[PDB]
Ligand binder design. Structure first.
Ligand SMILES: CCCCCCCCCCO[C@@H]1O[C@H](CO)[C@@H](O[C@H]2O[C@H](CO)[C@@H](O)[C@H](O)[C@H]2O)[C@H](O)[C@H]1O
Ligand SMILES: [F-]
Ligand SMILES: [F-]
Ligand code: NA
Lengths: 96, 123
């Protein structure tokens, strides 16, 4: 009934080696967000970290300059029917 | 046992009502899920009216009393869904709404029990 996926994922600020991203929270109790990032340009390992549910921004560091990254966010959220479960992801591309 | 049937029939009706109201309405306001709140408030109201009504009608078959209280009100209300909702809010860092949920469920349910009792007592 209610989407648990964040919306309007975007890069709000950037340096050659880092990205400040933000999104709009979904209308559910988010316990934490999981942020993934990896080079868009072949088999290169995707990395992940968590951000608390009250935050709707995150910094990604230690990137390489001039490289395309695929960045995704999904939620670990509480709901009545599923208790703690994971949403689908929202995804963007950004070139440092 | 006849008593067991009262518990199961009343319980099953209450549990079913809670399930329907919770699935339909909880996601409308996730900071204080209103389906879980409404069934606790309603069970509070019914047990209040039962409190007053059974006092004035002492020869009511223990079957109907057991079906209404242990069965319906017991199946309808929940402390466990209430708790996990609060626990989730606490894990999400949402302290203000965790506290608010506890106050609204507890103070609210006591008020409904009082209303149910005093409405019937004032008839
Ligand atoms: C009177 C009440 C009865 C007792 C029951 C208490 C309930 C249990 C505590 C809730 O669980 C913790 O909540 C933290 C607070 O939300 C979470 O921290 C998360 O969120 C914090 C808030 O920013 C971050 O600082 C942490 O690093 C991050 O792990 C943490 O993971 C989680 O295990
Ligand atoms: F109650
Ligand atoms: F709650
Ligand atoms: Na119950």
């Amino acid at each position: 009934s209610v989407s648990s996926v964040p919306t309007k994922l975007e890069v709000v600020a950037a340096t050659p080696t880092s990205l400040l991203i933000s999104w709009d929270a979904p209308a559910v109790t988010v316990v934490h967000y999981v942020i993934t990032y990896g080079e868009t340009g072949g088999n290169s390992p995707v990395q992940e970290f968590t951000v608390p549910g009250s935050k709707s921004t995150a910094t990604i560091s230690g990137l390489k300059p001039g490289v395309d990254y695929t960045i995704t966010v999904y939620t670990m959220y509480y709901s009545y029917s599923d208790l703690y479960s994971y949403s689908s992801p929202i995804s963007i591309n950004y070139r440092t | 046992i006849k008593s067991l049937f009262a518990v199961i029939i009343g319980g099953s009706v209450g549990c079913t009502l809670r399930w329907l109201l919770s699935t339909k309405f909880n996601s409308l306001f996730p900071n204080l899920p209103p389906g879980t709140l409404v069934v606790n408030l309603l069970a509070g109201l019914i047990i209040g009216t039962a409190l007053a009504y059974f006092l004035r009608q002492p020869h009511l078959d223990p079957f109907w009393k057991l079906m209404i209280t242990t069965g319906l009100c017991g199946g309808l209300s929940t402390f466990s869904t209430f708790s996990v909702e609060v626990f989730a809010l606490l894990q999400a860092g949402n302290y203000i709404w965790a506290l608010t949920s506890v106050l609204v469920h507890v103070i609210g349910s006591l008020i409904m029990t009082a209303l149910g009792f005093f409405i019937i007592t004032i008839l």
